[PDB]
Amino acid sequence: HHTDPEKVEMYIKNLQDDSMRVRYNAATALGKIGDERAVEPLIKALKDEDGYVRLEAAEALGEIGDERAVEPLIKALKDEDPDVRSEAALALGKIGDERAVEPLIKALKDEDRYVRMAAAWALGKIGGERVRAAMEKLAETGTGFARKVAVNYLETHK
Amino acid sequence: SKGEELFTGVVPILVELDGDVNGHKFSVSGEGEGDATYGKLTLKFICTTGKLPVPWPTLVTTLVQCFSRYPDHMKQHDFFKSAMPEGYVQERTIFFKDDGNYKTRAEVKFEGDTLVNRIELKGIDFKEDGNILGHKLEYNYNSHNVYIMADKQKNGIKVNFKIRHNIEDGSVQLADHYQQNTPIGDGPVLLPDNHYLSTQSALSKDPNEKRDHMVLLEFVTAAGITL
């Protein structure tokens, strides 16, 4: 598909603007736009001094769906801020990489509920056998929120 | 689906809300029209009870997802349309980061041939010098993704998302939305694989209207599945 290079430049630049609302908007923008040139800059936005900015940059990388950002996202799951680590989960379920199956299953056990909920979807999205596998094991090794999820997938998915 | 046939052109819309936030009673009502062919929603909502105790954005989400533009290949996943015209029930719980929380119950259905949303809101724990009760929020909205996932156990969907409300001279007040929808009638409905929706909303103000109001321009368009 086609990406307006004028805006692409602008927004990747704006990613290092003094104002945070600016660089927050640049994240959302570049996610929708979906250009490969924004992936690298967005992983470096993933370490942004501001949390809300880190946060978008995450889902932004999810939207763009490039397999490059899988690892940095997995590391971003461990972010201090929970909201950021939630959107990182969601992002990883979008990309659909199997490499996020474990770190997501680990997040089903996260302290914050939204982050537990995010992962749930994300895994549900990725699916297939390597998910179906870890789910069947979790119906026994798991407990509480996480356990409730495992059974629900094995209910729905084959 | 039989529901989707209804939304083929432009369909008029109506919304009514009764709310109570930390005691502050109020009610909102709105009128407009929606072309699911473009995912477009265009409406005007007004506080009937004079002044609104909260900032308009909070209520956006609670105050129709049947007008969502589902692509051709994903047409099997529009639970909302499928549930019509009998309609569906949208129950939410909205935790504001470092502030209070809402509980809502909406009844979204077709009346004659107008889409109608009837909501019943309950707010608690909201800080008085909070952003909500302190009206510290900008008059605009962001693009968000609404994460959808079927509920085999019940017979509908668990929806979840995290709204980002801009502060006037500040960052962002978050809002974890925990949603759940369920059908009104007993008809058969589509239950979808995990996908999401991509929203674009615009807030504006009519100069001629003197009441407490909001002018909304939405564009929900579904994404996720691939074929």
Numbering used by the authors:
A (entry chain D): 9 to 166
B (entry chain A): 2 to 64, 68 to 231
The authors write:
The structures of two independent αRep binders in complex with the GFP target were solved by X-ray crystallography revealing two totally different binding modes.
The refined structure consists of residues 2–231 for EGFP (chains A, B and C) and residues 9–166 for bGFP-C (chains D, E and F). The interaction surface between bGFP-C and EGFP is quite different from that of complex 1: bGFP-C has less repeats than bGFP-A and almost all of its diversified residues are involved in the interaction: 23 out of 24 randomized residues are located in the interface and 21 out of 24 randomized residues are involving in contacts with EGFP from chains D, E, F respectively. The favourable enthalpic contribution reflects the important involvement of hydrogen bonds in this interaction, as corroborated by the structure: the bGFP-C–EGFP complex involves 165, 154 and 156 contacts with 9, 9 and 8 direct H-bonds for A:D, B:E and C:F heterodimers respectively.
